[PDB]
Design a protein around this ligand. Structure first.
Ligand SMILES: CCCCCCCCCCCCCCCCCC(=O)OC[C@H](COP(=O)([O-])OCC(O)COP(=O)([O-])OC[C@@H](COC(=O)CCCCCCCCCCCCCCCCC)OC(=O)CCCCCCCCCCCCCCCCC)OC(=O)CCCCCCCCCCCCCCCCC
Ligand code: BCL
Ligand code: BCL
Ligand SMILES: CC[C@H]1c2cc3[nH]c4c(c3C)C(=O)[C@H](C(=O)OC)c4c3nc(cc4[nH]c(cc(n2)[C@@H]1C)c(C(C)=O)c4C)[C@@H](C)[C@@H]3CCC(=O)OC/C=C(/C)CCC[C@H](C)CCC[C@H](C)CCCC(C)C
Ligand SMILES: CC[C@H]1c2cc3[nH]c4c(c3C)C(=O)[C@H](C(=O)OC)c4c3nc(cc4[nH]c(cc(n2)[C@@H]1C)c(C(C)=O)c4C)[C@@H](C)[C@@H]3CCC(=O)OC/C=C(\C)CCC[C@H](C)CCC[C@H](C)CCCC(C)C
Ligand SMILES: CC(C)=CCC/C(C)=C\CC/C(C)=C\CC/C(C)=C\CC/C(C)=C/CC/C(C)=C/CC/C(C)=C/CC/C(C)=C/CC1=C(C)C(=O)c2ccccc2C1=O
Ligand SMILES: CCCCCC/C=C\CCCCCCCCCC(=O)O[C@H](COC(=O)CCCCCCCCCCCCCCC)COP(=O)(O)OC[C@@H](O)CO
Ligand SMILES: CCCCCCCCCCCCCCCC(=O)OC[C@H](COP(=O)(O)OCCN)OC(=O)CCCCCCCCCCCCCCC
Ligand SMILES: COC(C)(C)C/C=C/C(C)=C/C=C/C(C)=C/C=C/C(C)=C/C=C\C=C(C)\C=C\C=C(C)\C=C\C=C(C)\C=C\CC(C)(C)OC
Ligand code: HEC
Ligand SMILES: CCCCCCCCCCCC[N+](C)(C)[O-]
Ligand SMILES: CCCCCCCCCCCC[N+](C)(C)[O-]
Ligand SMILES: [Ca+2]
Ligand SMILES: [Ca+2]
Ligand SMILES: [Fe+3]
Ligand SMILES: [Mg+2]
Lengths: 280, 311, 318, 255, 57, 56, 58, 56
């Protein structure tokens, strides 16, 4: 089925790879070459996750195997394997799922580019999705490579990856003092504030008080000038929201990338360059 | 800023994230800066005991005259090499105790013998010599006194925290955990043993004092928290490393050193050895470890000096 | 290549807009508006005017008192030395009262200033809430902003007031300071047995991540259709245009379903609001109901188990 | 006394009940445009089966327009509009191919709905988007070049015409369109700022969307001093068709 | 010494904003002084005068 | 030593903004000075003078 | 020895902005120097000179 | 140089003056701060005498 206004946009072409071969929809989904390619990566990765849950860390007969949703964990190899492929039951399964995940993500983004070409719209969304992919690849590719072992990746488990985050963080004693981490968090918080402000404002002028007509661009600008003496503007709030969300992802990737590869001591002690300036 | 790649070590199970990272070039230079002085040649272990040859030997009674001389040579290089034998001895009278350095040194011998014989749960067979702390200086470089912190006006009580302090590795956590925990014996545990509320009165500020002590410990050993903990459950011994057990005994060892060996010497120590509160320079993890997981990278010096053990 | 509509290349100017006229009872606005060229590169160049009645005047007075009490105490903690105040600024703080005072008003020299800053900041925020409410009322707009603001105020109140009162001690509230409030954040997780295992912490993270996901998606979606006037969301909502059609089809073809130009702002509203609702609930339950979140997760069967490769003898057992 | 049920567990379950209720609320709101779906199931059923999925559509809300502009309802019954294209294959899920010259087909990225034939208005009730000829209180911000008199080039660098005016938003001051006096036919056509790059030192506006000769067929304004919503969509959509249609290479694929 | 044309201040400063700012300033000042004095030896609520009511029970 | 045309400053500086700024600055300065004095040995509230009022 | 045409500085720099800036700068500097002096041995408030007024009551 | 005066045909005299004033005030603050952080400190050096000692 199609949205009642959709048929007049379902045009042939705009593919990057594949042309007419895969140029079709399946229900709502556009497929194309990267839909097929992404589907294979995705279905394989998910089924290898279920297979990893089925055999557990030490075989399906041990007390450690579990289908409990919180406890399932597929883990990377020991650091001793370095940049080599571990045996499937010793972290190699995690490594293959990682390659599947990256391919699924990147194929998803290129499918999005083909959709933009069909619709004649800007490429902001696949560009923005690339920042999330970049952060994932810093976590499983750039940072592990710089330290010399794929085993620095995080495990694929709903709660087990929180244990990874905790223990990597406290390797630096007090990870809160990571300067790129402070900046990234500031962007995450500011983004959430900005999103609630934006959502609120659009809903409050299109759903005004009873008896009122729909409000105007002049109301939107007046409302925040009245509260903070400034209005960024209806176009610019979307510029701002995109800037804050991408900055949050970017400084995230930076903050984990420097943790190990470019800094090994506690994070509070980094700030000693400031304390030690010959000014005070 | 540092450059990749770092040195790495896996501590816990794969994916749990218990890993250590270090700078390779700083490690190599630290190893050079933590060299142990080569042991003296073995001495003649025969003849009369020092207990029956000398006039006022109260601790090293059972050494032969040769081993006793060798011990005196060794402590001179370890403690007062620039000054020599008479840093601890009245000129022309070796038996005299009329110099404060000799009285202090006598108790220092008992400290080391107690550590090497009675505290192996901490120092194992590696043990300690005078060198471990003094490093060739009469005053150990990494002794400590109670820290008063920055000045406040008279109408505002100091908080003991919120200040950039090397002692807690530049966090704004309570910056003197040494006095309450490595001298006095305040409770370090705050984590509950039951899921539900009802039986744990420990406080968030106690958590911060404990966190401050743990920053100091980590910095003193040059390690991260996962050297001893799985940080998903800091309290859970079953998920901790064997280094945590060792560290537990080391805290009690340090308390014993400060309470029973350093503090009772306060009256004979000069005013130059005391902090603004009148307390003597004394011992923390840093004093021996000096930012290394084992003092001197674990060099076994004490085993070659029989006088550094009890009986 | 194409124009990405990130920066305005050519700004235009018009006489400053004084704002939509307000009903009788509102005070006249104040300030002579100015224009910033550099703000005009990314957004609106006009700064001002501003509204300021009794609610906001009282809010700002309470808030400046609170802020000045904090800064004063920071400077006093380095003995008035302005150079050391700049050196240690991120470390300095205004500290909650000692535990011995419980919830009683503590002495000026040891916690009274914290209690006054918390009181006056709280009144300042509550009055700011009334301000956001009144400013929507005077324009004839609905109260979506004040409802979301109330959800954030709920979380703030739980952190510094509700939980400390429930737990019987101002010493359990949050210090005013940069690095000190980060110490407090980490110490709270330590004290309560690892906040990762608090299920409302997990939800708050899902919604904080989701807020950045959704603003990246929506921000980028709207700029990609700004070539069709899609940033003018009021008239795209009343009079669906090819901006709104292409936006919805981009997402339907990508992930199988889509929303509307109006209803994406409802998804965004709830995602952001649920971030602080779940955050308040999570802290509200810590110490009062659950003393150790990890053991609560063990009890309910959630905590992963690992092969034992390190373990330690308990010297309290030995 | 010990119990498995505890207040944290109670509260998290209460949250799930609320959250799933919220999702169903939101999915209903999501269906106020575009539903019921155009399917081949409704065709063969003679219209008997309306495809709406789950949850079902909400009851209509009303938008009351200012200045006595009327009432908009959502959801609403919208009339089918013929598609100027033929399916590339008869199989379901296949794309369609525009009839005639693609630029002019009103199909694909050239497509757009028929918005209302009246102008967006300022709060005071004047036409919102107007040329600087009409809104004489507007000026170019000092520091920025005046686009008037710049030469407009198409995707292949050929001269399409000159900028004859600038169309501004009177509600929120900004350029929304450039007015281009087209060399080929001397008509004045709108050019959205969204499709315009400034080459400031050369005083050139570059338009990647279409060729210079394509400017001859940019849709025209009924009234030279204002623009209706309807005309805004027809203008912007015509440029966007060029993104896919203006050259052969733009069809893809790369490989 | 006051001034006979002091009344002309209301030709200079807006009477409504002056009134609003005085009300606001005095509310904050009143709350601030009570809290400052309650944080000192002068506290009249926790002074056990005339008696301690927590000791009666 | 003063100047005879000093009144002309009000041809230069707006009387309204000057008056407002003066009273805002003086009120803040007075808050600040009382805070400084209260934080020192000169504190007159917690000095137990003429007596301490906190009974046991 | 300053120049005779130095008054022409008020043809270049705005007398209003200059007067406001000097006033603002001088106030901040005054606050800063008092604080710097109070942070040192020169402190005249907590020096208990002439007497300690807290000692009277404690 | 004889033609150095032409620099005022290139650089706005007003902005150069303001920038010179702003930079010199900041530099002056910076250098006093730096010098006070060291052994040369003349305020906290108990010279000619310690006034806190006087009060004891
Ligand atoms: C249930 C969905 C299925 C329903 C159904 O019958 O579908 C049949 C339907 C066909 O039915 P039809 O006859 O056309 O009828 C029209 C439909 O009824 C049209 O009906 P409709 O318009 O109602 O259909 C929409 C439907 C159909 O859409 C889809 O088909 C895809 C749906 C994917 C669902 C993804 C859910 C993700 C959830 C993650 C788990 C987390 C949950 C939250 C946890 C806490 C978070 C805080 O999607 C949904 O109903 C669910 C959408 C909402 C889920 C939102 C999740 C929220 C999570 C929280 C986010 C933060 C909250 C902020 C506050 O669709 C298909 O057959 C799809 C075919 C499969 C194609 C696969 C190949 C694609 C190749 C390219 C991609 C490669 C990869
Ligand atoms: C003791 C533990 C430490 C700590 C240890 C660390 C460590 C270690 C890390 C962080 C990272 C982060 N921390 Mg921290 N951190 C702590 C406390 C905090 C606090 C707080 C309130 O105290 C906050 C706000 C933060 C905030 C942050 C963010 C800046 C960052 C996580 C966002 C991110 O990476 O986005 C980027 C987003 C992604 C990587 C997601 C990628 C998504 C991909 C592309 C798509 C997936 C699709 C999916 C499979 C689809 C499924 C389909 C459905 C099934 C249908 N931390 C403490 C003090 N922190 C992390 C980071 O920066 O990572 C880069 C990180 O590694
Ligand atoms: C031991 C250290 C000394 C001390 C050494 C000095 C020295 C030295 C000086 C001051 C100066 C000042 N000191 Mg002090 N000062 C001490 C303790 C105090 C205490 C206190 C609570 O203890 C207070 C509140 C003051 C307050 C003051 C201000 C009155 C004055 C700076 C005003 C300014 O910056 O104008 C900036 C504003 C402008 C430039 C705008 C134009 C000025 C307007 C038109 C006039 C405003 C009123 C004027 C300053 C009145 C001054 C009268 C008396 C001389 C005080 N001092 C002690 C006892 N103090 C300075 C001063 O006297 O300046 C004359 C100064 O040189
Ligand atoms: C959906 C959850 C998120 C959220 C929502 C939210 N926050 C909100 C709102 C909403 C919906 C508001 O409506 C409200 C707001 O007004 O935002 C624009 C607010 C707000 N969120 C704020 C901050 C904030 N929100 C945060 C978080 C969040 N807000 C979430 C992540 C954070 C974090 C992450 O820590 C902070 C730091 C403020 C910007 C604003 C509330 C402002 C307020 O209460 O002000 C009164 C308090 C004062 C201290 C007033 C002080 C006055 C100033 C110092 C100005 C001084 C003026 C003076 C006259 C100057 C004179 C000097 C002369 C020399 C000229
Ligand atoms: C950069 C700013 C933020 C951002 C933006 C962003 N994300 C995006 C987009 C954009 C602009 C999309 O267009 C795209 C999308 O289509 O959204 C609807 C996407 C998306 N962001 C998503 C998720 C998401 N984004 C997140 C974050 C962020 N995305 C940022 C903070 C996170 C966090 C923070 O954790 C997650 C969970 C998806 C909804 C969607 C991408 C969907 C996709 O790629 O589908 C293909 C893949 C599958 C269907 C599943 C693949 C399965 C794998 C093959 C196996 C699983 C391996 C995995 C590594 C295991 C992980 C296990 C544990 C960690 C639990
Ligand atoms: C049940 C089942 C099949 C089990 C079998 C499992 C096995 C073995 C295999 C299945 C796995 C395989 C092979 C494929 C599954 C993948 C498929 C086909 C679909 C899943 C797609 C997918 C990633 C869905 C995730 C959707 C989620 C949760 C997104 C999070 C972001 C989010 C909350 C979006 C909701 C709001 C939306 C829709 C925003 C988009 C949106 C935005 C942002 C606007 O700005 C805008 C402006 C104007 C108009 C409309 C819009 C608009 O729609
Ligand atoms: C920067 C300051 C801009 C400014 O100060 O602009 C002033 C106006 O302020 C006004 O309206 C009020 C301007 C106050 C707003 C300043 C910016 C507020 C912060 C905006 C960002 C949002 C806050 C964060 C939200 C998450 C200038 O006007 P006046 O002071 O009246 O004097 C001008 C005289 O010539 C009158 O003849
Ligand atoms: C732990 C326990 C759970 C915690 C959850 C806490 C949730 C509340 C905290 C957040 C407060 C929000 C305040 C604003 C609300 C608001 O604004 O709603 C009003 C607006 C509508 O306004 P409008 O724009 O249409 O017009 C404005 C003109 N007046 O939006 C909504 O109708 C959203 C719809 C409400 C959500 C429905 C949820 C139903 C759950 C049913 C569960 C059934 C299970 C049964 C099991 C037996
Ligand atoms: C010298 O400084 C001057 C004067 C120049 C001005 C400078 C000021 C500066 C530099 C200030 C800097 C401030 C900073 C850096 C602040 C950082 C603050 C942070 C990070 C705060 C974070 C969290 C704090 C929280 C959440 C606190 C909450 C406290 C609450 C909610 C308390 C409420 C208390 C109440 C309602 C009390 C009621 C009193 C009752 C009624 C109980 O009395 C009996
Ligand atoms: C301080 C660190 C010392 C230095 C340096 C040297 N000696 Fe020592 N000596 C020291 C102590 C604490 C003691 C008493 C030991 C005990 O068991 O009670 C001594 C004792 C001697 C003696 C015995 C004197 C006697 O009682 O008859 C002798 C002969 C002696 N020391 C010699 C000696 C020499 C030759 C040294 C330099 C190489 C020397 N000592 C250094 C502490 C310290
Ligand atoms: C709103 C929540 C109401 C909570 C009332 C708590 C009253 C104080 C109780 C504190 N305590 C620990 C002494 O019981
Ligand atoms: C929606 C919130 C419902 C909360 C119900 C809990 C009421 C009593 C809570 C006190 C602690 C209860 N319990 C079982 C954990 O001890
Ligand atoms: Ca009383
Ligand atoms: Ca008194
Ligand atoms: Fe929007
Ligand atoms: Mg603290």
């Amino acid at each position: 089925a199609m949205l009642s206004f959709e048929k007049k946009y379902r045009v042939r072409g705009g593919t990057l790879i594949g042309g007419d071969l895969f140029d079709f929809w399946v229900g709502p989904f556009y497929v194309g070459f990267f839909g097929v390619v992404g589907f294979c990566f995705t279905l394989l990765g998910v089924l290898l996750i279920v297979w990893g849950a089925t055999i557990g860390p030490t075989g399906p007969t041990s007390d450690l195997q579990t289908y409990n949703l919180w406890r399932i964990s597929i883990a990377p190899p020991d650091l001793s394997y370095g940049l080599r492929m571990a045996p499937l039951t010793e972290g190699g399964l995690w490594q293959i799922i990682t390659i599947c995940a990256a391919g699924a993500f990147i194929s998803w983004a290129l499918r999005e580019v083909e959709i933009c070409r069909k619709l004649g719209i800007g490429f902001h969304v696949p560009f923005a999705f690339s920042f999330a992919i970049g952060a994932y690849l810093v976590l499983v590719f750039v940072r592990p490579l710089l330290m010399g072992a794929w085993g620095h990746g995080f495990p694929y488990g709903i709660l087990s990856h929180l244990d990874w985050v905790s223990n990597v963080g406290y390797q630096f004693l007090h990870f809160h003092y990571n300067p790129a981490h402070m900046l990234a968090i500031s962007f995450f918080f500011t983004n959430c504030l900005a999103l609630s402000m934006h959502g609120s404002l659009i809903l409050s002028v299109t759903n005004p008080q009873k008896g009122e007509p729909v409000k105007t661009s002049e109301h939107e600008n007046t409302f925040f000038r009245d509260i903070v003496g400034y209005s960024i503007g209806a176009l610019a709030i979307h510029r701002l929201g995109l800037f804050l969300a991408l900055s949050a992802a970017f400084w995230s990737a930076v903050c984990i990338l420097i943790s190990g590869p470019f800094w090994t001591r506690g994070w509070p002690e980094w700030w000693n360059w400031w304390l030690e300036l010959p000014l005070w | 800023c540092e450059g990749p790649p770092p040195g790495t070590e896996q501590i816990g199970y794969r994916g749990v994230g218990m890993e250590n990272y270090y700078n390779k070039r700083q490690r190599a230079l630290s190893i050079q800066a933590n060299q142990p002085v080569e042991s003296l040649p073995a001495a003649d272990s025969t003849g009369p005991k020092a207990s029956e040859v000398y006039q006022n030997v109260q601790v090293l009674k059972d050494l032969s005259v040769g081993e006793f001389t060798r011990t005196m040579v060794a402590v001179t290089t370890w403690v007062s090499p620039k000054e020599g034998c008479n840093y601890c001895h009245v000129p022309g009278n070796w038996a005299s105790d009329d110099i404060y350095t000799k009285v202090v040194s006598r108790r220092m011998f008992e400290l080391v013998r107690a550590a090497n014989s009675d505290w192996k749960a901490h120092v194992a067979e590696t043990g300690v010599t005078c060198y471990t702390c003094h490093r060739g200086n009469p005053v150990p470089k990494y002794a400590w006194v109670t820290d008063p912190g920055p000045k406040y006006p008279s109408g505002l009580k100091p908080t003991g925290q919120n200040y950039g302090s090397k002692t807690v590795a530049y966090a704004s956590l309570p910056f003197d955990p040494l006095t309450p925990f490595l001298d006095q014996a305040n409770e370090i545990r705050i984590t509950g043993n039951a899921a539900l509320a009802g039986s744990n009165p420990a406080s968030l500020k106690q958590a911060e004092w404990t966190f401050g002590l743990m920053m100091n410990i980590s910095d003193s050993l040059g390690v991260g928290c996962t050297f001893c903990h799985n940080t998903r459950a800091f309290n859970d011994w079953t998920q901790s490393t064997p280094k945590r057990t060792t560290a537990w005994y080391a805290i009690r060892h340090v308390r014993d050193i400060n309470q029973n060996y350093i503090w009772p010497l306060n009256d004979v120590l000069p005013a130059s050895r005391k902090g603004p509160y009148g307390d003597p320079l004394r011992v923390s993890c840093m004093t021996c470890h000096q930012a290394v997981n084992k003092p001197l990278y674990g060099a076994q010096m004490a085993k070659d000096y029989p006088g550094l053990y009890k009986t | 290549p194409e124009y990405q509509n990130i920066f305005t290349a050519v700004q235009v100017r018009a006489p400053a807009y004084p704002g939509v006229p307000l009903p009788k009872g509102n005070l006249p606005r104040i300030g002579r508006p100015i224009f910033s060229y550099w703000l005009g590169k990314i957004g609106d160049a006009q700064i001002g005017p501003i509204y300021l009645g009794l609610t906001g005047t009282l809010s700002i007075f309470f808030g400046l008192v609170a802020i000045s009490i904090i800064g004063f105490n920071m400077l006093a903690s380095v003995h008035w030395d302005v150079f050391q105040f700049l050196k240690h600024f991120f470390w300095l703080g205004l500290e909650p009262p000692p535990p011995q005072y419980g919830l009683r008003i503590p002495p000026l020299s040891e916690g009274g200033w914290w209690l006054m800053a918390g009181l006056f900041l709280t009144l300042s925020i509550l009055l700011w809430w009334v301000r956001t409410y009144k400013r929507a009322e005077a324009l004839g707009m609905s109260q979506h902003l004040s409802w979301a603001f109330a959800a954030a105020i709920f979380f703030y109140l739980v952190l510094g007031f509700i939980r400390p009162v429930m737990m019987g001690s101002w010493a359990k509230a949050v210090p005013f300071g940069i690095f000190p409030h980060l110490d407090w954040t980490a110490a709270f997780s330590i004290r309560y047995g690892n906040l990762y295992y608090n299920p409302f912490h997990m939800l708050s993270i899902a919604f904080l991540y989701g807020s950045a996901l959704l603003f990246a998606m929506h921000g980028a979606t709207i700029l990609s259709v700004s070539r069709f006037g899609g940033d003018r969301e009021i008239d795209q909502i009343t009079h669906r245009g090819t901006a709104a059609e292409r936006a919805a089809l981009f997402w339907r073809w990508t992930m199988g379903f889509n929303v509307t130009m109006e209803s994406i702002h409802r998804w965004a509203w709830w995602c952001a609001v649920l971030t602080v609702i779940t955050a308040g609930i999570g802290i509200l339950l810590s110490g009062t109901v659950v003393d150790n979140w990890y053991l609560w997760a063990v009890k309910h069967g959630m905590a992963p188990a690992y092969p034992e490769v390190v373990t330690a003898v308990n010297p309290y057992e030995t | 006394i010990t119990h498995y049920i505890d207040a944290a567990q109670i509260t998290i379950w209460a949250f799930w009940l609320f959250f799933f209720g919220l999702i169903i609320y939101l999915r209903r709101e999501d269906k106020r445009e575009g539903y019921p779906l155009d399917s081949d199931r409704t065709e063969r059923s003679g219209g008997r089966v309306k495809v709406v999925g789950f949850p079902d559509l909400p009851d209509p809300k009303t938008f009351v327009l200012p200045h006595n502009g009327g009432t908009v309802v959502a959801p609403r019954v919208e009339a089918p509009v013929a598609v100027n294209a033929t399916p590339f294959s008869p199989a379901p899920g296949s794309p369609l191919v525009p009839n005639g010259d693609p630029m002019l087909s009103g199909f694909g990225p050239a497509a757009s709905p028929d918005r209302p034939k009246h102008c967006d208005l300022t709060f005071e009730g004047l036409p919102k988007i107007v040329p600087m000829r009409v809104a004489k209180e507007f000026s170019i911000a000092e520091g920025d070049p005046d686009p008037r008199g710049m030469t407009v080039v198409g995707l292949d660098g050929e001269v399409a015409g000159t900028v004859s005016d600038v169309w501004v938003d009177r509600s929120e001051p900004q350029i929304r369109y450039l007015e281009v006096e087209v060399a080929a036919n001397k008509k004045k056509v709108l050019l959205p700022i969204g499709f315009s790059r400034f080459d400031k030192k050369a005083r050139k506006v570059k338009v990647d969307a279409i060729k210079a000769a394509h400017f001859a067929n940019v849709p025209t304004l009924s009234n030279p001093d204002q623009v209706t919503l309807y005309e805004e969509d027809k203008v912007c959509a015509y440029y966007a068709g060029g993104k896919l249609y203006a050259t052969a290479e733009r069809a893809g694929p790369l490989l | 010494t006051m001034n006979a044309n002091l009344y002309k201040i209301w030709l200079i400063l807006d009477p409504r904003r002056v009134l609003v700012s005085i009300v606001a300033f005095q509310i904050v000042l009143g709350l601030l002084i009570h809290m400052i004095v309650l944080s000192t030896d002068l506290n009249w609520l926790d002074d056990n005068i005339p008696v301690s009511y927590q000791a009666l029970g």
